[PDB]
């Protein structure tokens, strides 16, 4: 039974990486947005007159 | 194999003054490419027969 | 998940490779962060520096250009903002470009566009006195240029005590 | 006319073509070359008054003084015809008698 409780504690840890993941990838989603338009921002209000 | 530290790139100190400007006097013109993708392989994936 | 034992490891073979597909998609997340840095700050091709005497028509930059004093040489308001702000298994790693660069970025973008304009954004920079330059600012909007020139003396305090009030306001 | 959004340069056209799950662009830019030195001055005075150029800028080459537009070394002489005047020489920091 030793094995059925590691079992237990690896599929919570599992599903508790997973969820992590899946944060981390939502939340660079946005710093990707709002780093495209902090790119576009300082491509055409610093280099030129807009 | 060696290792360094990066170079930010040239260095320059442009002659500024009070009364002088500068004005070009040729040209050239520039085609340049640029790649985007817009479109990912339709894929369909049966529940049960998976 | 096994934190160093046996069994737990051969437990978890079974599994497939679910380890490999996960740290297989925060390389790339870091990959795109340092990205994210470069496309952002390195828009320039050369590195530009301003000249020792600084005349600009009365306009006073001197709370926005670096100071050579501090070590890092940021800026008031860049030491400011610097001030302001606040394992088991997990690494941390450091970003590509360190902050002294970016400050360097920074400092050449700035002194470019103190000189040459908008002249260095599309070909090689191009100096131009700082008054005549914010003529043909003006002159972009709708406002004859006639203006600045006239107005000279009150625009440059005006810009030097909003800039006074941003510091305090900081 | 918004800069480097296609093309780093001055924009003149662009050409699409395909590609197995994408497009490419071919941007057409102006980029100009061959700078050179002179000296400026914001204003001019004559007979009191103080012109300014309409469309271009005031240069020497150390001995005359020319407008021109700004892009593209091209010099003129001063005439009425592309100078406007308001006011006299007495306020504005960097006149030159001409
Ligand atoms: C502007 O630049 C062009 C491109 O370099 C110059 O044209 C060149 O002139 C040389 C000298 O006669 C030729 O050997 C090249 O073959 C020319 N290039 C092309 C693409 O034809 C042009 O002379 C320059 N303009 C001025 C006023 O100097
Ligand atoms: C630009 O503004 C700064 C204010 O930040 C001026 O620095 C002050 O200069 C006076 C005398 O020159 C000193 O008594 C102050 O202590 C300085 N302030 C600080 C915070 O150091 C600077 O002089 C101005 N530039 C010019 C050309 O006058
Ligand atoms: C500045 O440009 C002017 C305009 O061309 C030059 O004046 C002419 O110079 C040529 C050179 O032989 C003479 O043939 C002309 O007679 C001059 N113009 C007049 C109205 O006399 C002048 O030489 C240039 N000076 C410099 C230092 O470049
Ligand atoms: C451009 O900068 C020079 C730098 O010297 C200025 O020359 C000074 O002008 C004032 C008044 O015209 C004189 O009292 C100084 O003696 C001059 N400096 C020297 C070293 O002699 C010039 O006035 C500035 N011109 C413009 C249009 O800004
Ligand atoms: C431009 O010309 C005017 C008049 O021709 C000059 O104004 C005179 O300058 C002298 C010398 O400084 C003064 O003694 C006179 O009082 C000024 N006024 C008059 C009505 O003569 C002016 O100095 C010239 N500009 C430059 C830069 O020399
Ligand atoms: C203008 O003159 C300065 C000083 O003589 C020099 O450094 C600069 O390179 C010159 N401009 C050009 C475009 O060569």
């Given at each position: 039974?030793?094995?059925?409780?590691?079992?237990?504690?690896?599929?919570?840890?599992?599903?508790?990486?997973?969820?992590?993941?899946?944060?981390?990838?939502?939340?660079?989603?946005?710093?990707?947005?709002?780093?495209?338009?902090?790119?576009?921002?300082?491509?055409?209000?610093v280099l030129g007159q807009? | 194999?060696?290792?360094?530290?990066?170079?930010?790139?040239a260095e320059n100190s442009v002659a500024y003054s009070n009364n002088s400007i500068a004005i070009p006097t040729?040209?050239?013109?520039?085609?340049?490419?640029?790649?985007?993708?817009?479109?990912?392989?339709?894929?369909?994936?049966?529940?049960?027969?998976? | 998940?096994?934190?160093?034992?046996?069994?737990?490891?051969?437990?978890?073979?079974?599994?497939?490779?679910?380890?490999?597909?996960?740290?297989?998609?925060?390389?790339?997340?870091?990959?795109?962060?340092?990205?994210?840095?470069?496309?952002?700050?390195?828009?320039v091709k050369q590195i530009y520096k301003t000249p020792p005497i600084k005349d600009f028509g009365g306009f006073?930059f001197?709370?926005?250009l670096?100071?050579?004093?501090?070590?890092?040489?940021?800026?008031?308001?860049?030491?400011?903002?610097?001030?302001?702000?606040?394992?088991?298994?997990?690494?941390?790693?450091?970003?590509?470009?360190?902050?002294?660069?970016?400050?360097?970025?920074?400092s050449a973008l700035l002194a470019g566009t103190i000189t040459s304009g908008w002249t260095f954004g599309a070909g090689a920079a191009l100096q131009i006195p700082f008054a005549m330059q914010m003529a043909y600012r003006?002159?972009?909007?709708?406002?004859?240029?006639?203006?600045?020139?006239?107005?000279?003396?009150?625009?440059?305090?005006?810009?030097?005590?909003?800039?006074?009030?941003?510091?305090?306001?900081? | 006319?918004?800069?480097?959004?296609?093309?780093?340069?001055?924009?003149?056209?662009?050409?699409?073509?395909?590609?197995?799950?994408?497009?490419?662009?071919?941007?057409?830019?102006?980029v100009p070359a061959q700078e050179k030195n002179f000296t400026t001055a914001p204003?001019?005075?004559?007979?009191?008054?103080?012109?300014?150029?309409?469309?271009g800028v005031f240069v020497s080459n150390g001995?005359?003084?020319?407008?021109t537009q700004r892009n593209f070394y091209?010099?003129?002489?001063?005439?009425?015809?592309?100078?406007?005047?308001?006011?006299?020489?007495?306020?504005?920091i960097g006149?030159?008698?001409?």
């Amino acid at each position: 039974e030793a094995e059925v409780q590691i079992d237990r504690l690896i599929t919570g840890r599992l599903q508790s990486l997973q969820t992590y993941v899946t944060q981390q990838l939502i939340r660079a989603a946005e710093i990707r947005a709002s780093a495209n338009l902090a790119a576009i921002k300082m491509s055409e209000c610093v280099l030129g007159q807009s | 194999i060696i290792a360094y530290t990066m170079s930010l790139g040239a260095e320059n100190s442009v002659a500024y003054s009070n009364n002088s400007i500068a004005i070009p006097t040729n040209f050239t013109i520039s085609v340049t490419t640029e790649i985007l993708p817009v479109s990912m392989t339709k894929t369909s994936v049966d529940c049960t027969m998976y | 998940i096994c934190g160093d034992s046996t069994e737990c490891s051969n437990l978890l073979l079974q599994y497939g490779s679910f380890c490999t597909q996960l740290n297989r998609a925060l390389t790339g997340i870091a990959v795109e962060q340092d990205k994210n840095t470069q496309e952002v700050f390195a828009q320039v091709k050369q590195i530009y520096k301003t000249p020792p005497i600084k005349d600009f028509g009365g306009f006073n930059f001197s709370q926005i250009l670096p100071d050579p004093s501090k070590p890092s040489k940021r800026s008031f308001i860049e030491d400011l903002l610097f001030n302001k702000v606040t394992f088991n298994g997990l690494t941390v790693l450091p970003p590509l470009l360190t902050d002294e660069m970016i400050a360097q970025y920074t400092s050449a973008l700035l002194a470019g566009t103190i000189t040459s304009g908008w002249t260095f954004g599309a070909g090689a920079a191009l100096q131009i006195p700082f008054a005549m330059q914010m003529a043909y600012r003006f002159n972009g909007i709708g406002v004859t240029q006639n203006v600045l020139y006239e107005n000279q003396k009150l625009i440059a305090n005006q810009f030097n005590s909003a800039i006074g009030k941003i510091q305090d306001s900081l | 006319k918004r800069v480097d959004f296609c093309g780093k340069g001055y924009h003149l056209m662009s050409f699409p073509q395909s590609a197995p799950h994408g497009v490419v662009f071919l941007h057409v830019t102006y980029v100009p070359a061959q700078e050179k030195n002179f000296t400026t001055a914001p204003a001019i005075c004559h007979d009191g008054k103080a012109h300014f150029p309409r469309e271009g800028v005031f240069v020497s080459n150390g001995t005359h003084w020319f407008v021109t537009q700004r892009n593209f070394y091209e010099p003129q002489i001063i005439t009425t015809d592309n100078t406007f005047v308001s006011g006299n020489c007495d306020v504005v920091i960097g006149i030159v008698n001409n």
